[PDB]
Amino acid sequence: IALPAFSQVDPEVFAALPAELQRELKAAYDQRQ
């Protein structure tokens, strides 16, 4: 996390990676929230 990837770029990119990892980037942002 803490990367600019959270910007947007493209959807296919987010869905391209495994949920296990995609959830680590989304959840991490929620944990601190």
PDB file of N, CA and C in Angstrom:
ATOM      1  N   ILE A   1       0.824  -1.202   0.000  1.00  0.00           N
ATOM      2  CA  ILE A   1       0.000   0.000   0.000  1.00  0.00           C
ATOM      3  C   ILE A   1       0.862   1.258   0.000  1.00  0.00           C
ATOM      4  N   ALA A   2       0.232   2.400   0.255  1.00  0.00           N
ATOM      5  CA  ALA A   2       0.942   3.673   0.288  1.00  0.00           C
ATOM      6  C   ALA A   2       1.491   4.031  -1.088  1.00  0.00           C
ATOM      7  N   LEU A   3       1.036   3.310  -2.107  1.00  0.00           N
ATOM      8  CA  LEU A   3       1.483   3.552  -3.475  1.00  0.00           C
ATOM      9  C   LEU A   3       0.424   4.313  -4.267  1.00  0.00           C
ATOM     10  N   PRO A   4       0.852   4.953  -5.365  1.00  0.00           N
ATOM     11  CA  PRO A   4      -0.045   5.724  -6.231  1.00  0.00           C
ATOM     12  C   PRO A   4      -1.010   4.834  -7.006  1.00  0.00           C
ATOM     13  N   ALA A   5      -0.807   3.524  -6.910  1.00  0.00           N
ATOM     14  CA  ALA A   5      -1.660   2.566  -7.601  1.00  0.00           C
ATOM     15  C   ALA A   5      -3.126   2.770  -7.231  1.00  0.00           C
ATOM     16  N   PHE A   6      -3.360   3.320  -6.044  1.00  0.00           N
ATOM     17  CA  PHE A   6      -4.717   3.566  -5.571  1.00  0.00           C
ATOM     18  C   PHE A   6      -5.417   4.605  -6.443  1.00  0.00           C
ATOM     19  N   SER A   7      -4.636   5.312  -7.253  1.00  0.00           N
ATOM     20  CA  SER A   7      -5.179   6.339  -8.134  1.00  0.00           C
ATOM     21  C   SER A   7      -6.350   5.794  -8.946  1.00  0.00           C
ATOM     22  N   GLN A   8      -6.036   5.010  -9.973  1.00  0.00           N
ATOM     23  CA  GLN A   8      -7.061   4.425 -10.829  1.00  0.00           C
ATOM     24  C   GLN A   8      -6.432   3.596 -11.944  1.00  0.00           C
ATOM     25  N   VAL A   9      -5.839   4.277 -12.919  1.00  0.00           N
ATOM     26  CA  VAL A   9      -5.199   3.604 -14.042  1.00  0.00           C
ATOM     27  C   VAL A   9      -6.221   2.852 -14.887  1.00  0.00           C
ATOM     28  N   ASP A  10      -6.604   1.666 -14.425  1.00  0.00           N
ATOM     29  CA  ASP A  10      -7.578   0.847 -15.137  1.00  0.00           C
ATOM     30  C   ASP A  10      -8.121  -0.257 -14.235  1.00  0.00           C
ATOM     31  N   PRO A  11      -9.364  -0.684 -14.506  1.00  0.00           N
ATOM     32  CA  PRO A  11     -10.025  -1.737 -13.730  1.00  0.00           C
ATOM     33  C   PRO A  11      -9.399  -3.108 -13.962  1.00  0.00           C
ATOM     34  N   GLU A  12      -9.131  -3.425 -15.224  1.00  0.00           N
ATOM     35  CA  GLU A  12      -8.532  -4.706 -15.579  1.00  0.00           C
ATOM     36  C   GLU A  12      -7.270  -4.962 -14.760  1.00  0.00           C
ATOM     37  N   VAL A  13      -6.606  -3.884 -14.356  1.00  0.00           N
ATOM     38  CA  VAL A  13      -5.384  -3.990 -13.565  1.00  0.00           C
ATOM     39  C   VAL A  13      -5.682  -4.503 -12.161  1.00  0.00           C
ATOM     40  N   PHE A  14      -6.693  -3.920 -11.525  1.00  0.00           N
ATOM     41  CA  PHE A  14      -7.079  -4.317 -10.176  1.00  0.00           C
ATOM     42  C   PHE A  14      -7.594  -5.754 -10.159  1.00  0.00           C
ATOM     43  N   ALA A  15      -8.417  -6.093 -11.146  1.00  0.00           N
ATOM     44  CA  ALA A  15      -8.978  -7.435 -11.246  1.00  0.00           C
ATOM     45  C   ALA A  15      -7.933  -8.431 -11.738  1.00  0.00           C
ATOM     46  N   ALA A  16      -6.863  -7.914 -12.331  1.00  0.00           N
ATOM     47  CA  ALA A  16      -5.790  -8.759 -12.843  1.00  0.00           C
ATOM     48  C   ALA A  16      -5.068  -9.478 -11.709  1.00  0.00           C
ATOM     49  N   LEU A  17      -4.870  -8.773 -10.600  1.00  0.00           N
ATOM     50  CA  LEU A  17      -4.190  -9.346  -9.442  1.00  0.00           C
ATOM     51  C   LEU A  17      -5.142 -10.213  -8.625  1.00  0.00           C
ATOM     52  N   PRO A  18      -4.572 -11.090  -7.787  1.00  0.00           N
ATOM     53  CA  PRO A  18      -5.352 -11.990  -6.932  1.00  0.00           C
ATOM     54  C   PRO A  18      -6.078 -11.247  -5.816  1.00  0.00           C
ATOM     55  N   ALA A  19      -7.312 -11.659  -5.542  1.00  0.00           N
ATOM     56  CA  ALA A  19      -8.111 -11.033  -4.497  1.00  0.00           C
ATOM     57  C   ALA A  19      -7.332 -10.944  -3.190  1.00  0.00           C
ATOM     58  N   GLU A  20      -6.566 -11.988  -2.889  1.00  0.00           N
ATOM     59  CA  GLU A  20      -5.772 -12.027  -1.668  1.00  0.00           C
ATOM     60  C   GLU A  20      -4.901 -10.780  -1.545  1.00  0.00           C
ATOM     61  N   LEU A  21      -4.371 -10.323  -2.675  1.00  0.00           N
ATOM     62  CA  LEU A  21      -3.519  -9.139  -2.695  1.00  0.00           C
ATOM     63  C   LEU A  21      -4.351  -7.871  -2.857  1.00  0.00           C
ATOM     64  N   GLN A  22      -5.381  -7.948  -3.692  1.00  0.00           N
ATOM     65  CA  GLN A  22      -6.256  -6.807  -3.934  1.00  0.00           C
ATOM     66  C   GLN A  22      -6.973  -6.390  -2.654  1.00  0.00           C
ATOM     67  N   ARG A  23      -7.173  -7.348  -1.755  1.00  0.00           N
ATOM     68  CA  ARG A  23      -7.848  -7.081  -0.491  1.00  0.00           C
ATOM     69  C   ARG A  23      -6.879  -6.487   0.528  1.00  0.00           C
ATOM     70  N   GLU A  24      -5.596  -6.789   0.362  1.00  0.00           N
ATOM     71  CA  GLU A  24      -4.569  -6.286   1.267  1.00  0.00           C
ATOM     72  C   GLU A  24      -4.340  -4.792   1.053  1.00  0.00           C
ATOM     73  N   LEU A  25      -4.571  -4.334  -0.171  1.00  0.00           N
ATOM     74  CA  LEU A  25      -4.389  -2.926  -0.508  1.00  0.00           C
ATOM     75  C   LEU A  25      -5.627  -2.114  -0.143  1.00  0.00           C
ATOM     76  N   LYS A  26      -6.792  -2.746  -0.238  1.00  0.00           N
ATOM     77  CA  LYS A  26      -8.050  -2.086   0.085  1.00  0.00           C
ATOM     78  C   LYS A  26      -8.303  -2.101   1.590  1.00  0.00           C
ATOM     79  N   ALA A  27      -8.091  -3.258   2.209  1.00  0.00           N
ATOM     80  CA  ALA A  27      -8.291  -3.404   3.645  1.00  0.00           C
ATOM     81  C   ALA A  27      -7.317  -2.529   4.427  1.00  0.00           C
ATOM     82  N   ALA A  28      -6.057  -2.535   4.008  1.00  0.00           N
ATOM     83  CA  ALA A  28      -5.028  -1.742   4.669  1.00  0.00           C
ATOM     84  C   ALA A  28      -5.455  -0.283   4.791  1.00  0.00           C
ATOM     85  N   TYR A  29      -6.070   0.239   3.735  1.00  0.00           N
ATOM     86  CA  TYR A  29      -6.525   1.624   3.723  1.00  0.00           C
ATOM     87  C   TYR A  29      -7.689   1.824   4.690  1.00  0.00           C
ATOM     88  N   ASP A  30      -8.412   0.744   4.966  1.00  0.00           N
ATOM     89  CA  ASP A  30      -9.550   0.798   5.877  1.00  0.00           C
ATOM     90  C   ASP A  30      -9.095   0.638   7.324  1.00  0.00           C
ATOM     91  N   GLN A  31      -8.096  -0.213   7.534  1.00  0.00           N
ATOM     92  CA  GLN A  31      -7.570  -0.457   8.872  1.00  0.00           C
ATOM     93  C   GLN A  31      -7.181   0.851   9.552  1.00  0.00           C
ATOM     94  N   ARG A  32      -6.391   1.662   8.856  1.00  0.00           N
ATOM     95  CA  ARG A  32      -5.946   2.942   9.394  1.00  0.00           C
ATOM     96  C   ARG A  32      -7.114   3.918   9.511  1.00  0.00           C
ATOM     97  N   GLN A  33      -8.181   3.648   8.766  1.00  0.00           N
ATOM     98  CA  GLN A  33      -9.362   4.503   8.787  1.00  0.00           C
ATOM     99  C   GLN A  33     -10.247   4.179   9.986  1.00  0.00           C
TER     100      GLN A  33
END
